[PDB]
Amino acid sequence: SPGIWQLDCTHLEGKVILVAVHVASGYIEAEVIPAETGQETAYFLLKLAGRWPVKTVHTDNGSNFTSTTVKAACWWAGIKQEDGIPYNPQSQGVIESMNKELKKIIGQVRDQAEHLKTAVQMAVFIHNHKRKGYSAGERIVDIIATDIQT
Amino acid sequence: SPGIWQLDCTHLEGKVILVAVHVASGYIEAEVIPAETGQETAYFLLKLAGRWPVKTVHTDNGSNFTSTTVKAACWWAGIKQEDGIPYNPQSQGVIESMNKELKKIIGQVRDQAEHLKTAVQMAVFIHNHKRKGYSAGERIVDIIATDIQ
Ligand SMILES: NCCCCC(=O)N[C@H]1Cc2ccccc2[C@H]1Cc1ccc2c(c1C(=O)O)OC[C@H](CCC(=O)O)O2
Numbered sequence: 001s002p003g004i005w006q007l008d009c010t011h012l013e014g015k016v017i018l019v020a021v022h023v024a025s026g027y028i029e030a031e032v033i034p035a036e037t038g039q040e041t042a043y044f045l046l047k048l049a050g051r052w053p054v055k056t057v058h059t060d061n062g063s064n065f066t067s068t069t070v071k072a073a074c075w076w077a078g079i080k081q082e083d084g085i086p087y088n089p090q091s092q093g094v095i096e097s098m099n100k101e102l103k104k105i106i107g108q109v110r111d112q113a114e115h116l117k118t119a120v121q122m123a124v125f126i127h128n129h130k131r132k133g134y135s136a137g138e139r140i141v142d143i144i145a146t147d148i149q150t
Numbered sequence: 151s152p153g154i155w156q157l158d159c160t161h162l163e164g165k166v167i168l169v170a171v172h173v174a175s176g177y178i179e180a181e182v183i184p185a186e187t188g189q190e191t192a193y194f195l196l197k198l199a200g201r202w203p204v205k206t207v208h209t210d211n212g213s214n215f216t217s218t219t220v221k222a223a224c225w226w227a228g229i230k231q232e233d234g235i236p237y238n239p240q241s242q243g244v245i246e247s248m249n250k251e252l253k254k255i256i257g258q259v260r261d262q263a264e265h266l267k268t269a270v271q272m273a274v275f276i277h278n279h280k281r282k283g284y285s286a287g288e289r290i291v292d293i294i295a296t297d298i299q
């Protein structure tokens with residue numbers, strides 16, 4: 001569970017926002033890309049795994065699950081690539097709510113940035129720092145630190 | 151000390167590699183950019199601060215220290231922007247050694263990637279996972295977790 005991440009792809013302003021969610025904490029990293037390709041997803045996962053101890057990734061769709069480039073990145077970075085089938089049905093809704101929340105924050109900051117990518121990173125910041133009382137950023141660190149002492 | 155980061159800019163293949171080092175752990179994040187501008191540096195810091203609790207950044211040079219865009223990003227993200235003057239002189243050498251190490255790793259992986267940016271991220275991965283025995287990734291998490299409690 002400390003190593004489990006979920007991929008999530010959402011759309012805004014004719015562009016694609018690719019999100020990785022650390023399932024146990026709600027912590028996220030995100031990027032804007034022109035379109036969701038295997039190459040973009042692979043590069044995104046490589047970055048993520050160099051930054052956090054990513055053991056398992058629930059991929060966001062079948063094309064990324066199948067993609068030989070995504071598979072090569074997962075092999076390179078030591079990531080187990082799994083499907084993202086919500087056998088647990090509350091998973092869909094949690095992701096849906098996060099996309100709506102992220103888009104709301106993006107709208108609240110949108111005017112402060114000339115480019116969408118900046119607004120997205122501002123939203124990542126606000127999301128990870130928001131105290132719910134611990135923040136997502138605090139929860140991911142504690143979960144992984146606990147796991148290292150083990 | 152858990153919140154202190156250092157910016158570092160190095161060059162390879164006619165491009166610029168921008169690095170942020172978490173001083174207490176040796177943990178890094180890095181990106182390739184065409185050139186080091188205030189705008190690039192500002193965006194890089196915004197990303198970094200959304201991901202880790204960045205309290206203080208020792209900027210890598212006077213142009214980024216002065217840059218109004220870098221200052222605006224630091225204000226936005228709640229970062230104290232300081233100079234990066236190595237009043238402690240072993241700081242220069244530690245950064246110098248890391249740049250040489252990173253470039254060595256980049257060379258060892260260079261053939262596995264079509265683009266420099268990929269090789270740089272592979273080097274970030276290898277650097278942060280390397281056991282020296284804890285890894286830099288393990289050290290940053292422990293330092294920050296200790297601080298939260
Ligand atoms: N006429 C002067 C207006 C000054 C406006 C001004 O300083 N805003 C601050 C507010 C603010 C708040 C947080 C972070 C950055 C910023 C700055 C905005 C900014 C900076 C770098 C960027 C940006 C943009 C953007 O505006 O989105 O876009 C992506 C780009 C990608 C990397 C590259 O390509 O370099 O880096």
Ligand SMILES: NCCCCC(=O)N[C@H]1Cc2ccccc2[C@H]1Cc1ccc2c(c1C(=O)O)OC[C@H](CCC(=O)O)O2
Binds near residue numbers: 039043073076265266
């Ligand atoms: N002819 C078939 C050859 C297939 C080669 C092949 O699968 N290599 C793996 C090995 C490997 C190992 C780790 C991570 C990725 C990869 C892949 C390489 C790769 C993927 C995405 C990229 C890449 C490159 C690159 O090669 O550097 O470059 C940056 C780009 C940036 C985001 C964008 O622009 O989309 O994303």
